[PDB]
């Protein structure tokens, strides 16, 4: 099935746009990345950097994940990101999202050999 690295790339990588310009960016991107297929995925974050930049985060600041494991890494520098949150008036299959564009440090869980992002934990 899909590898954890490619799932992280489908759910969280959007290098070809430097930033979200539209309020509907999340409605479009959550639909086309297959995150509203059987359910509205309530929370997602897209990262607007190159794959090599995002993968370099796995050799940067080692920190604890929310689940208590220390396979997480915090980026030393801020990155262009867009957070997607399902709103109160959102009902499947018509999923509605608030788009929040921001320049924030990201924290990703890294795993495997090669050692790459498999999970987006948070942004700080």
Task: Map out the domains of the chain with their CATH numbers.
Answer: 1-124 (3.10.130.10)
Q: How far apart are CA 14 and CA 82, in angstroms?
A: 9
**Annotation says 105 is catalytic:** no
CA distance 66 to 51: 24
Among the listed residues 8, 12, 80, 95, the single catalytic one is: 12
Which residue of the set 33, 48, 71, 119 is catalytic?
119
- Is 39 a known ligand-binding residue? no
Q: Which technique was the structure solved with, according to the deposited record?
A: X-ray
What is the per-residue burial (b if ≥16 Cβ within 10 Å, else e) of 3-26? eebeebbebbbbbeeeebeeeebb
Question: Does residue 44 have a known ligand-binding role?
Answer: yes
The reported resolution of this PDB entry, expressed in Å, is 2.3
Active site residue 48: no
ω into residue 114 within 30 of 0, thus cis? Answer: yes
């Amino acid at each position: 099935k899909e590898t954890a690295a490619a799932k992280f790339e489908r759910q969280h990588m959007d290098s070809s746009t430097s930033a979200a310009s539209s309020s509907n960016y999340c409605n479009q991107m959550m639909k086309s990345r297959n995150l509203t297929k059987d359910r509205c995925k309530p929370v997602n974050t897209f990262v607007h950097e190159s794959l090599a930049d995002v993968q370099a985060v796995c050799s940067q600041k080692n920190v604890a994940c929310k689940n208590g494991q220390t396979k997480c890494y915090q980026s030393y520098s801020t990155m262009s990101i867009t957070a997607c949150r399902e709103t109160g008036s959102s009902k499947y299959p018509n999923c509605a999202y608030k788009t929040t564009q921001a320049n924030k440090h990201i924290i990703v869980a890294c795993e495997g050999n090669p050692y790459v992002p498999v999970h987006f934990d948070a942004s700080v």
